[PDB]
Amino acid sequence: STGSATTTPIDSLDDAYITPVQIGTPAQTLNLDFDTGSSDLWVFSSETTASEVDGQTIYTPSKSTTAKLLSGATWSISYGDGSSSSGDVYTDTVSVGGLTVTGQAVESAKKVSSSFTEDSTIDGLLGLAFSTLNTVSPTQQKTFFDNAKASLDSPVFTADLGYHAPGTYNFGFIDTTAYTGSITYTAVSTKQGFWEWTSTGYAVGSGTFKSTSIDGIADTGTTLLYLPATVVSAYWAQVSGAKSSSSVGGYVFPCSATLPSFTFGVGSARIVIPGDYIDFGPISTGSSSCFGGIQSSAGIGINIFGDVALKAAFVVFNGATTPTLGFASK
Ligand SMILES: NCc1ccc(C(F)(F)F)cc1
Ligand SMILES: NCc1ccc(C(F)(F)F)cc1
Numbered sequence: 001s002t003g004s005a006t007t008t009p010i011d012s013l014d015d016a017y018i019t020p021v022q023i024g025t026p027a028q029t030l031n032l033d034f035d036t037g038s039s040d041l042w043v044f045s046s047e048t049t050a051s052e053v054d055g056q057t058i059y060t061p062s063k064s065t066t067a068k069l070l071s072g073a074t075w076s077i078s079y080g081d082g083s084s085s086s087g088d089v090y091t092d093t094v095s096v097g098g099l100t101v102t103g104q105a106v107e108s109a110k111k112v113s114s115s116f117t118e119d120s121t122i123d124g125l126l127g128l129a130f131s132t133l134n135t136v137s138p139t140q141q142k143t144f145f146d147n148a149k150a151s152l153d154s155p156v157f158t159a160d161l162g163y164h165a166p167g168t169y170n171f172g173f174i175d176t177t178a179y180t181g182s183i184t185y186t187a188v189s190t191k192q193g194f195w196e197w198t199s200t201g202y203a204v205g206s207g208t209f210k211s212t213s214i215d216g217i218a219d220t221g222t223t224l225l226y227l228p229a230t231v232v233s234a235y236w237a238q239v240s241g242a243k244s245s246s247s248v249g250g251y252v253f254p255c256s257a258t259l260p261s262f263t264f265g266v267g268s269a270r271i272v273i274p275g276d277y278i279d280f281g282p283i284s285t286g287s288s289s290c291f292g293g294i295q296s297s298a299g300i301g302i303n304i305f306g307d308v309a310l311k312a313a314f315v316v317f318n319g320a321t322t323p324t325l326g327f328a329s330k
Contacts, residue, residue, distance in 0.1 A: 002172035003099025024064030030123035035221030039133035042107035043124035055120035105141035133193035161311035179314035179328035184269040205260030216303030226297040226304040255290040
């Protein structure tokens with residue numbers, strides 16, 4: 001079987017993408033953030049503290065005839081930006097774009113951090129990293145992808161994120177009309193639970209390509225591109241008036257500047273990120289300083305190929321027994 005769902009940016013800056021997901025019987029439709037950097041499916045629910053809910057659609061297990069409480073199970077997660085949530089665990093039927101999984105662990109949030117409460121358009125997260133990172137205790141739970149793998153025509157899903165436009169998550173098949181040229185596959189390390197791979201280098205604008213190994217993770221759940229300080233410094237040195245601002249927390253640049261493109265290597269192939277993709281707009285309303293989409297990973301400890309990079313490509317997440325990542329131009 002296969003599934004296909006449209007994913008839509010939540011705002012004009014492509015800060016995140018939401019995808020409708022049907023949970024329960026009868027279906028309750030929630031808009032979830034598909035996150036290849038985590039492995040928990042958690043949702044705002046009728047059990048969430050009422051003061052921590054501001055406009056989200058909530059999952060109500062008591063209205064689902066297929067929901068079962070997973071006796072004694074709890075979950076607690078903390079994200080790399082400081083966000084967190086926790087609660088109890090149900091099992092229920094979950095469908096994405098026509099692809100149905102029965103008995104999926106649905107983690108019901110009793111408490112959410114402030115950053116989720118303020119994001120009225122995100123009803124939860126759907127983790128698509130490896131199941132070793134799932135936080136359910138005492139019995140670890142499988143991701144939606146892991147549960148669907150058996151029945152999929154092919155054990156893959158693909159991410160086709162749009163620039164200021166809707167995109168597509170496909171499960172079980174590779175749409176050969178969605179990209180140009182060939183797909184270049186590269187090896188994945190699963191030792192930390194992430195879709196971790198090694199980029200073969202980079203170039204700034206029309207500059208020379210610098211062959212150098214950059215280990216990082218493919219993370220649809222992270223907005224920006226986080227790279228080593230040496231790389232990020234070489235990029236922003238080409239932007240007149242750009243500087244690192246401690247008060248803002250990263251590189252900013254004059255909103256009137258035009259940004260160079262950024263190229264990253266995948267094996268022998270090259271993925272080009274247009275300079276417009278790196279503009280994340282004024283740091284405050286009316287400001288003439290704009291926030292950069294390429295930032296240093298020094299404070300984070302891991303390099304992150306977030307949405308800024310992934311939306312420049314067609315990305316195949318190949319969950320075969322030897323997993324690989326595929327990149328193609330589009
Ligand atoms: N998108 C989920 C996520 C969040 C944070 C991290 C970090 F910061 F720990 F690398 C990885 C993945
Ligand atoms: N990387 C996971 C993640 C995704 C979204 C959010 C936000 F924006 F909703 F707070 C935080 C963390």
